[PDB]
Design a protein around this ligand. Structure first.
Ligand SMILES: O=C(NCCN1CCCC1=O)Nc1ccccc1
Ligand SMILES: O=C(NCCN1CCCC1=O)Nc1ccccc1
Ligand SMILES: [Zn+2]
Ligand SMILES: [Zn+2]
Ligand SMILES: [Zn+2]
Ligand SMILES: [Zn+2]
Lengths: 197, 197
């Protein structure tokens, strides 16, 4: 009769957000993005993407860490696996490439929980939390994981991004603002028993 | 690097849906419903509600079992805990009262997973997957659980209800049809590794 996973949260003021050099996107436009997805599909099949959900609290209110590219899109930290790369090692590699320190001290990433799966049927924006009817060759599969933070840490934010802490109410029913994966994080996080340290 | 929970699904044709006498709602109207919630809040505080999510497949496509009252609302099987009642024993009690057999043979209910939490701030329809800002006395707290079915079973459906199997695509982004809890089941179920037996 205690079936919820227990997750420790720490205050946002426990974390230090330093700076490092810009990290440029792999694609210069939407059209370039879907051309490269089409080219790689022909060589190695479906794109395998992993993303991390990192939580803090302020005054006992959970907040998700988002990376905002300039003043455009909000992103979760993550990216593309290489062929034959383990999903959990890969997400740890990508989070170190995005938020890892200038002084080369390693973060202690802890990943123990899957919180969802999304599939892209075509070389187009629509994504779904299932494989849609009649679709045998999805073009992309995304896997989301909860990343348990340590009590304190220093993250290095690439200079072209801002790290922003968003409360759950601002994400909720806000697909226009955040799109369909980030806007459904409130519902996906509701199963956890958060401890406010 | 295998962090997903594994869940066995069986075909819908493995299950027999018999009939029994009507099960009438506790409240004859929305106004009667929120009057009784207001009366009980004053005596025992917040309403504690539990609901079950029961999954099958047909042709390897997952479907959620829904109870439709005549041709109005779709419902998950569930209901109200009594004061000091355990959540998991309570859901097993309520599922036996709704779908338990006329011949008094017990179902073997297996409940091992929480899939979400919803909170009602006021004596009004709005519900959220978090406690909203400034709300210290929520009026209702709902807990949803995944109910693992056995390979075969006979359920007795009250005569005033139809048991319906809905695919995930029909629930997805369909709050008008199903409301905000049932329409977010696709996203909440995406973390499971379903086995299609
Ligand atoms: O690439 C990321 N997430 C995977 C999903 N994608 C791909 C294109 C845009 C997007 O959100 N995230 C990310 C965040 C900061 C720096 C670098 C990468
Ligand atoms: O009561 C149920 N679920 C809890 C949430 N509520 C309360 C009012 C309507 C609603 O969906 N479910 C249910 C299903 C079949 C028969 C009897 C009960
Ligand atoms: Zn405070
Ligand atoms: Zn895949
Ligand atoms: Zn078949
Ligand atoms: Zn509560």
């Amino acid at each position: 009769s205690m079936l919820e996973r227990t997750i420790n949260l720490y205050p946002l003021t426990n974390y230090t957000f330093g700076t490092k050099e810009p990290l440029y996107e792999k694609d210069s436009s939407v059209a370039a993005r879907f051309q490269r997805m089409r080219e790689e599909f022909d060589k190695i099949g479906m794109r395998r993407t992993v993303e991390g959900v990192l939580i803090v609290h302020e005054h006992r209110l959970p907040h998700v860490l988002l990376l905002q590219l300039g003043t455009t899109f909000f992103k979760l930290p993550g990216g593309e696996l290489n062929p034959g790369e383990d999903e959990v090692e890969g997400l740890k590699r990508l989070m170190t490439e995005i938020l890892g320190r200038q002084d080369g001290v390693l973060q202690d990433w802890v990943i123990d929980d899957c919180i969802g799966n999304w599939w892209r049927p075509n070389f187009e924006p629509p994504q779904y939390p299932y494989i849609p009817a009649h679709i045998t060759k999805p073009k992309e599969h995304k896997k989301l994981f909860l990343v348990q933070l340590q009590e304190k840490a220093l993250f290095a934010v690439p200079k072209n991004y801002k790290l922003v802490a968003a409360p759950l109410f601002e994400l909720y029913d806000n697909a226009p603002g955040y799109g369909p994966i980030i806007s459904s994080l409130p519902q996906l996080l509701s199963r956890f028993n958060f401890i406010y340290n």
